[PDB]
Amino acid sequence: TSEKGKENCKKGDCAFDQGGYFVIKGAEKVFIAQEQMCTKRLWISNSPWTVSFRSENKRNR
Amino acid sequence: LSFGFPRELTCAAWNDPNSPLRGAKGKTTTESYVPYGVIENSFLTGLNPLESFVHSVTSRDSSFSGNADLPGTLSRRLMFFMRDIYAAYDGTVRNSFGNQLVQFTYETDGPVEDITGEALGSLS
Amino acid sequence: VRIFTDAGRLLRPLLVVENLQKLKQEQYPFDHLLDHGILELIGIEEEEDCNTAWGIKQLLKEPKIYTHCELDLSFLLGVSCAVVPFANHDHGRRVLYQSQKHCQQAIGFSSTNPNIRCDTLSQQLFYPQKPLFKTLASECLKKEVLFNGQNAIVAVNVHLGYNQEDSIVMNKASLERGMFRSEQIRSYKAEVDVQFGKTHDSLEDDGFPFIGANMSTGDIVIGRCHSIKLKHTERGIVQKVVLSSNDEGKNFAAVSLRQVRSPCLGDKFSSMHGQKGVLGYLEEQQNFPFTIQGIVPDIVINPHAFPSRQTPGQLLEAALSKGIACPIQAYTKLTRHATPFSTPGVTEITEQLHRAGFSRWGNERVYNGRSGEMMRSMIFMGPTFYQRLVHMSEDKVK
Amino acid sequence: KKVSYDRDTKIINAASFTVEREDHTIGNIVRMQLHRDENVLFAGYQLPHPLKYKIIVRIHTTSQSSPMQAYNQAINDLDKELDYLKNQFEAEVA
Amino acid sequence: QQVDARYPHPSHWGRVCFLSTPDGENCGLVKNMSLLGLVSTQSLESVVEKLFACG
Amino acid sequence: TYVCGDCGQENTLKSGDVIQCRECGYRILYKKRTRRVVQYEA
Amino acid sequence: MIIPVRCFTCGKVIGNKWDQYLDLLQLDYTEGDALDALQLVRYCCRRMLMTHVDLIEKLLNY
Amino acid sequence: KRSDHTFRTVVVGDPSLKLNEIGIPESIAKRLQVSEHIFRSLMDGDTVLMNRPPSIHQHSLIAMTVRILPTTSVVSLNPICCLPFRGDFDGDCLHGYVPQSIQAKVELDELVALDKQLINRQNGRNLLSLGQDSLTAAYLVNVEKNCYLNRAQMQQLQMYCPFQLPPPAIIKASPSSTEPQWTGMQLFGMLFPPGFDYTYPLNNVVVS
Amino acid sequence: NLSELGEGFLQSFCKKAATSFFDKYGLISHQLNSYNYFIEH
Amino acid sequence: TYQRFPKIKIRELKDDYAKFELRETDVSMANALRRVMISEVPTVAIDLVEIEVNSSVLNDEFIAHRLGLIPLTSERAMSMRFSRDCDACDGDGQCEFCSVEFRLSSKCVTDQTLDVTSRDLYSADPTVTPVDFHKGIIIVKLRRGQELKLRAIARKGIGKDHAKWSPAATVTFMYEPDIIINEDMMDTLSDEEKIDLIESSPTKVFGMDPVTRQVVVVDPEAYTYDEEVIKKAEAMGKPGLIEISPKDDSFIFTVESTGAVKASQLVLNAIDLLKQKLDAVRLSDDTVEAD
Ligand SMILES: [Mg+2]
Ligand SMILES: [Zn+2]
Ligand SMILES: [Zn+2]
C-alpha cells in the first residue's frame, strides 16, 4: 500500500486509514512510545551524591 | 514540585531565563518549589497558555483517582469493630461476643427512649 | 556548548524572524522553507536559551527583540484537544473529559469501506455532520472525521423538572427524522481446522444463513457439524458472510449482524465541553417552548449544570454558531474561527449576533407550547455540537 | 367511557371530569371557555402523568347551575366559535 | 512513562499535551503528543569535520 | 453462490474442502445476496 | 451519507436543494448568499446545508 | 454472595411518580417472577428493595412499590430521592432486589421503606429535602414579591396543591386593575396545613 | 524591513505553513520514520 | 358565558404559505389550532417497504427511513381510513381506502453516476402522487451494476407519531404589539442620542422621519419582543420613553406547508378536527350525566 497511485486508490484497501499499525493475528497492534532516560548526559543524583557515565554499546559504566 | 510561577503569567514572563518557572533561579541553587500564582484573567475573557498551564498544574491534583482505598478499608475495619453492638431489653448496651458490657445507658440527647432492639453500633 | 544529534529528541517547528523578509517580499512547501532557513526544528534544550513570541501579529510586530516566533498558540495541544472550541474558557477538569474519554466514545464516522472490515463491533451515524465553527487544526488538517456527532438546537431551560440531576430532555419528533440515529454492526467469528454444515430455520446448506434474515435469540448463526447459537442480548439482521483461510489449512468465518439503534430513554449523550447526561424524557413537538419564527428546540438542558461544572464557552459556541447560521438583512469578513488560544472577545460575538437581527446575549423570547402564554424571561437558544456516546441503557440490563 | 363523571362530596356543587386519550389542546380551551361563565368559581385542568394519556378537569359552580351543565355549555359555546371561524376563513379565502 | 511524574512540567511546551491526560491509574504517565511534534532518528554523516570549520 | 475477493467471479462451491476460488490464488469468499423479499418499517 | 429529506427541528423539505447549493457554490457566491438564494430564512434550515458532509462520493469509489 | 430474583438497569428522572414508588418498565416486570401462594409476574403494589452501588450508608437501601410504566430498558424515580442514594442521573446504574417470601415482604415496608426512613440517623434531621429546581422555584416565588398572579393562573396552580385557596389579598393594585391578583408568598402558603406554625428568626419567616 | 510585510500576510503564512507541515510529514511520521530506520540501517 | 366572534383577515395566501390575522379571540384558540395543525392533521406517507434487489452502497434501513420522509399529495387523507380501522382490507399491497401501493425499479448501466430521485416512484393511483417542486428528492446514487427494486405501500397516519405525517413544517402565531411613544420626552433628546436608540433595535422597528427629524414606527409587527430599546431608554435616563405591550386579543398567523395539503385546507382541517374532538368529548359527557 506504500506509494499507491491510481491503482489502489479505489481498490478496497483504505478507509480513513493512516497506515501506522501492525497485523499479527487479524488484530491491529500499535506501538506506544516509552520515555527512557538519556544516556548521553552526565547524570548526577543525591543520596548518595553520585555521578554516572552511561553505556554506549557495551556495559562500560 | 520542581518549578515555580513567574508572578506575571505573560509572554515575557515565560521567556525569562532568571524566572522560577525554569528551575534554579540562582539566588545557591533551588531544589523544590511550592507553586503560587494568581490569574488576572477569568473563564470569560479567555486564558493565556501560561495561565492555562498554571491552571492545569493546580487542577491535576483534583483528578487522580488515587488513595481511594482509605475510605473503604477504614469503613470495613470500623464495621468489623461495631457491627455486633446492640441494645438489650434490660436497658444496657451489650456486645454480641459473650454479652459483654459496653455502655450502661444510652445518651440523653434524644427523647425517643424506645431503642431496645436496634443495632446501635452498626448505625454508629 | 552541548550539541545533541541523537534520537529521542522531541522537536517542534518555529519560524525565525531574523530572515523573515527573505522569500516573502520577493503554495509554500515545507522543504523550501527548511532550505531557505525561514523555519527550523528547535529542540527542548535549544528553546531554553532563546526568546519566543506568541502571536504573529500582536506580540511580534512592535518589539523586535524575540528572534523567534510560534506558528500558533493552539498547536501546543493534541489532535483531540486543539479542535475543541473555547478550550481555555472551560475548566481544566472538564476539557480533560472531552479530549480523552468523550472523544473515543462519540459515535461518528466509521469507515468508507465496510466490506473489508470484519471488526467485532462497529457503529456509524446515518447523517454525520461537521460543526459550524472552524478551528485552525481542522482547517490545516483538512480532516472532516475529527468531529463525531451532530449539532442540535440546544436551549437552556427547565422542562417540568424532567432535566434535574444532569438529565436531558430531547425532541422526540426530531429524533425520528434522522437526528442522532446510528447503526450497529457486530460480527461473530469461528474457526474450523468438524465441518461447516447445517446437519439439521433460516440456515442454508453451507451452514450460514442467507443475507437478509432476521436473527434473534436461539437461532444458529454459524452452523458446524458444534453449532454456535445466539445469546440472550444478541440479535440483528445479517449484512454479509465472509469466508477465509490461512496458509496453515484452517478455515475461518465471519457473520456480521446489523441493527439500527434509535435514541432510547437511557442513552448517554455528551458535549464538546465535558457535559454528560442521559436522555430522560421524550417530549412531543407541540409541547416545547417555541420561538416566534416557529423554531422549537432540539435538546433542553438544565441551567444548574453550568455553575457547578464551570463550563463557559458552550454558550459562546452556541452564540457563534447562531450568528453564523442566521442571515444578515455582506456575509464576508464574518467571525467564523474558533481557534482556542486566539478566541474572539464577547463584543465580537454580541455584535455579530446583533447584526443578524437577534439579541446580543443569545436569549430569545419564547412562548409556552402547552398554553400559548408568553414567558417572563428570554430563553437562551443556539446550535451546539453534541455527541452520542456508546453507553446505551439496553446493554446494561442484567 | 371516554369522559367519566365524579362528584365531590366535600365541596357542594363540585365535580371532576376525566377525559381519556386527551392532551392540553382540548383541556386548555375548555378551561379558558369555562372562565367566561359568570357561574363558575373554579376552572382548571391538569395532566398528572405523561405516560397515562388522561386529563382531569375540576369545575366548581354556584347555586344557579350545574357542573355538567356548565361543561355542556362550555362545549356548545366553543363549537359555535369554531363554526364562526370556519365561516370567516371560508369567506376570507374566496 | 514506566514507573512528581504525574504532574505537568514547563518542558512540555509544544511537545506533549498538558491539558489532556487519561484519568485513573495512568494519570500523568501516558501523555498525548502535540500536533507539531517531530522526532529525530540519526545523523548518518559525521559533523566533527563540519564543527572544526567554524572556529 | 460465493463471490471472491480481488476479482469478479462467482464460485458456488459449497464443499467441505473447497475454500478458495477457481482461476484465482486468493482464498477470500464473500456471500452473494439472493433476491428475496424482506420487509422493514419506515 | 447524502442530505436528509426533511429538516430536523424545522421540518422543511431540503432533500432537493443540495445540487442547487453545490451549483451556487461552484460560482463566486458565499454561503449566506447561496442560502438566501434557496429561500431559507430560518437558521434551523440554514444549519443543515452548511454542516452536511458528502460521504457517498467516497462510498462509491472505495 | 450473589442471589436470584435481581435486576440492574440505568435510572432516569420522573417527577410525576410518588416518592415511595419506583418506575419499573413493562418489559422487565413481565419477565420478573415472584413467589405468591405458584409463580406470578410482577405487578403494581409489590415492594422491591433498591440499592445504588456502593452502599454509602444505611439510607441507600429503600423499599419502594412497583409502578408499571410503558417505557422500556430504563427505570425512573423522583429526583428528590437522589440524596439518600447519593447519586445522579448520569448513566449511574441502580440495582434492585425482589423479595420472594411473604415474611420478608411484610417486614420490608415496615422498617426499610421511605415512610420509615424519614429521620436522618446521622444528625437527627430530615432525610429528604428540596432538590435544585424546587429550591430555586421556592426561592424565586418568595424573594420577588412583585410578579402577581391572576385567578386563572392560581386555579391552575391549585390543581397540584393539596389544600384549598386562600383569600386573594390584592383587591386593586392599579386604577386600571379589573381583576384581583395574588401574591407569590400566598402560593407557597398553600402547602402548609392549617394547624402548622413555623418561625425562623434569621430570615424573618413567620408562619401562623 | 520590520513592518513592510503586513499583519494580514503573516497571519496567513502561519496557516499555509501549518497546512504544508501536515502535507510533508503527516500525522504519524514519528511511527513511520523510526520503523524505516530499522529496516534500512 | 357564551361564544366568541373571531375575525379573519388574510394578508397573503399561496399554495403552501398562508398569513392571516385572528382578532377578537383568546390565546388558547390560537395555540390549539397550531397544536392541531402541527401534530394532528392526517396525511398519507410510506410506512411499509419491501426491498429485494437492494445492491447499493447504503444500508437497507437507510432507504426505508428516507423514503417515508418524502411528502405525498394528500387530498384524500380526510376521506381515507386508518390501517387499524379497515376491516375489509387486512393490507397487502394496493387497497381500496387504507393502502396505496408504490413501485420502484432502477438499474444503472452507464460510465457516469445515475441519481435515483423521487420522480421515478410510480404509484397505482394518480391522486396519491409524490409532490413535485425541480430534480426531486434524492434517494440513492448508483454505479455500474448496483440495481435497486422495491415495493412500498402508503397509509394514512397522524402526525403525532414518527413525525412524517405532519403536513405543516413551521406554523406559529405572534402577539400584535402597539407602540406607545410619549412624543414629549423625544423633544428633549439630542440628535446623537436618537441614532443610538435607532441602532439599539435588532430588527427594523423604529425609523427616522426626514421631514420632521423625529422618530416614527414603521412595520410594527417585526419587534419579536426582545427588550433592547426599553433597556436602552432606561440606560439613557428615560424610563417612560417607549412602552411596548402585547395585545391579548390580536394574533398574526404564519402557516407553512410541505406541499402535501394546501395552505387554506390545512386550517380548514385543523378547524374540522377540533370540532370533531369537541363533539366526541361532549357525547360521553352528555350520555353519562344526563342519562
Ligand atoms: Mg453521575
Ligand atoms: Zn478469485
Ligand atoms: Zn384497505
PDB file of C-alpha atoms in Angstrom, chain C residues 13-91:
ATOM      1  CA  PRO C  13       8.887  23.832  14.154  1.00  0.00           C
ATOM      2  CA  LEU C  14       9.382  27.525  14.918  1.00  0.00           C
ATOM      3  CA  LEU C  15       9.816  30.355  12.420  1.00  0.00           C
ATOM      4  CA  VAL C  16      12.791  32.683  12.871  1.00  0.00           C
ATOM      5  CA  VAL C  17      12.109  36.373  12.208  1.00  0.00           C
ATOM      6  CA  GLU C  18      15.760  37.247  11.508  1.00  0.00           C
ATOM      7  CA  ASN C  19      15.325  36.287   7.845  1.00  0.00           C
ATOM      8  CA  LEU C  20      11.535  36.631   7.652  1.00  0.00           C
ATOM      9  CA  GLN C  21      11.865  39.054   4.708  1.00  0.00           C
ATOM     10  CA  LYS C  22      13.913  36.639   2.569  1.00  0.00           C
ATOM     11  CA  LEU C  23      11.343  34.782   0.441  1.00  0.00           C
ATOM     12  CA  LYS C  24       8.223  36.762   1.429  1.00  0.00           C
ATOM     13  CA  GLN C  25       8.779  40.242  -0.020  1.00  0.00           C
ATOM     14  CA  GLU C  26      10.470  38.776  -3.111  1.00  0.00           C
ATOM     15  CA  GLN C  27       1.748  27.435  -2.060  1.00  0.00           C
ATOM     16  CA  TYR C  28       4.736  27.255   0.308  1.00  0.00           C
ATOM     17  CA  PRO C  29       6.252  23.761   0.649  1.00  0.00           C
ATOM     18  CA  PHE C  30       7.873  22.907   3.967  1.00  0.00           C
ATOM     19  CA  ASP C  31      11.098  21.642   2.361  1.00  0.00           C
ATOM     20  CA  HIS C  32      11.642  25.027   0.673  1.00  0.00           C
ATOM     21  CA  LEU C  33      11.111  26.852   3.986  1.00  0.00           C
ATOM     22  CA  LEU C  34      13.541  24.477   5.709  1.00  0.00           C
ATOM     23  CA  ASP C  35      16.065  25.010   2.901  1.00  0.00           C
ATOM     24  CA  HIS C  36      15.856  28.819   2.931  1.00  0.00           C
ATOM     25  CA  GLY C  37      16.138  28.954   6.729  1.00  0.00           C
ATOM     26  CA  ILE C  38      12.750  30.549   7.407  1.00  0.00           C
ATOM     27  CA  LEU C  39      11.557  27.715   9.669  1.00  0.00           C
ATOM     28  CA  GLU C  40      13.637  25.323  11.751  1.00  0.00           C
ATOM     29  CA  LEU C  41      13.148  22.491  14.238  1.00  0.00           C
ATOM     30  CA  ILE C  42      14.098  23.663  17.745  1.00  0.00           C
ATOM     31  CA  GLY C  43      14.641  21.101  20.484  1.00  0.00           C
ATOM     32  CA  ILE C  44      13.603  21.378  24.108  1.00  0.00           C
ATOM     33  CA  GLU C  45      17.147  22.211  25.278  1.00  0.00           C
ATOM     34  CA  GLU C  46      17.700  24.710  22.455  1.00  0.00           C
ATOM     35  CA  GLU C  47      14.431  26.540  23.185  1.00  0.00           C
ATOM     36  CA  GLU C  48      15.516  27.464  26.728  1.00  0.00           C
ATOM     37  CA  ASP C  49      18.247  29.954  25.735  1.00  0.00           C
ATOM     38  CA  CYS C  50      16.071  31.943  23.314  1.00  0.00           C
ATOM     39  CA  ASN C  51      13.190  34.407  23.298  1.00  0.00           C
ATOM     40  CA  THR C  52       9.910  33.330  21.714  1.00  0.00           C
ATOM     41  CA  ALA C  53       6.822  35.356  20.821  1.00  0.00           C
ATOM     42  CA  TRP C  54       3.256  34.048  20.998  1.00  0.00           C
ATOM     43  CA  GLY C  55       1.359  35.854  18.232  1.00  0.00           C
ATOM     44  CA  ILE C  56       2.425  36.566  14.662  1.00  0.00           C
ATOM     45  CA  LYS C  57       0.757  39.994  14.589  1.00  0.00           C
ATOM     46  CA  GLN C  58       0.094  41.153  18.167  1.00  0.00           C
ATOM     47  CA  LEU C  59       3.241  40.424  20.181  1.00  0.00           C
ATOM     48  CA  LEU C  60       5.725  40.180  17.295  1.00  0.00           C
ATOM     49  CA  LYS C  61       5.072  43.404  15.363  1.00  0.00           C
ATOM     50  CA  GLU C  62       6.115  46.155  17.792  1.00  0.00           C
ATOM     51  CA  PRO C  63       9.110  44.581  19.696  1.00  0.00           C
ATOM     52  CA  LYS C  64      11.927  43.175  17.538  1.00  0.00           C
ATOM     53  CA  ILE C  65      13.705  41.534  20.475  1.00  0.00           C
ATOM     54  CA  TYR C  66      12.405  37.976  20.066  1.00  0.00           C
ATOM     55  CA  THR C  67      14.291  36.440  17.061  1.00  0.00           C
ATOM     56  CA  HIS C  68      11.797  33.518  17.114  1.00  0.00           C
ATOM     57  CA  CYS C  69       8.044  33.092  16.819  1.00  0.00           C
ATOM     58  CA  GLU C  70       5.415  30.371  17.028  1.00  0.00           C
ATOM     59  CA  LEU C  71       3.056  29.343  14.243  1.00  0.00           C
ATOM     60  CA  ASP C  72       0.007  29.242  16.523  1.00  0.00           C
ATOM     61  CA  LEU C  73      -0.630  29.045  20.251  1.00  0.00           C
ATOM     62  CA  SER C  74      -3.283  26.327  19.825  1.00  0.00           C
ATOM     63  CA  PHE C  75      -0.745  23.839  18.407  1.00  0.00           C
ATOM     64  CA  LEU C  76       0.629  23.083  21.891  1.00  0.00           C
ATOM     65  CA  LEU C  77      -2.236  20.609  22.446  1.00  0.00           C
ATOM     66  CA  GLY C  78      -3.144  17.239  20.993  1.00  0.00           C
ATOM     67  CA  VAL C  79      -5.234  16.481  17.937  1.00  0.00           C
ATOM     68  CA  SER C  80      -8.251  15.805  20.188  1.00  0.00           C
ATOM     69  CA  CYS C  81      -7.723  18.986  22.248  1.00  0.00           C
ATOM     70  CA  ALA C  82      -6.869  21.631  19.621  1.00  0.00           C
ATOM     71  CA  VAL C  83     -10.218  21.018  17.867  1.00  0.00           C
ATOM     72  CA  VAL C  84     -12.284  21.855  20.966  1.00  0.00           C
ATOM     73  CA  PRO C  85     -13.687  25.406  20.694  1.00  0.00           C
ATOM     74  CA  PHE C  86     -13.063  27.803  23.611  1.00  0.00           C
ATOM     75  CA  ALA C  87     -10.757  25.313  25.331  1.00  0.00           C
ATOM     76  CA  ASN C  88      -9.112  27.933  27.572  1.00  0.00           C
ATOM     77  CA  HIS C  89     -12.559  29.205  28.617  1.00  0.00           C
ATOM     78  CA  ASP C  90     -13.681  25.895  30.162  1.00  0.00           C
ATOM     79  CA  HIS C  91     -12.456  24.332  33.385  1.00  0.00           C
TER      80      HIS C  91
END
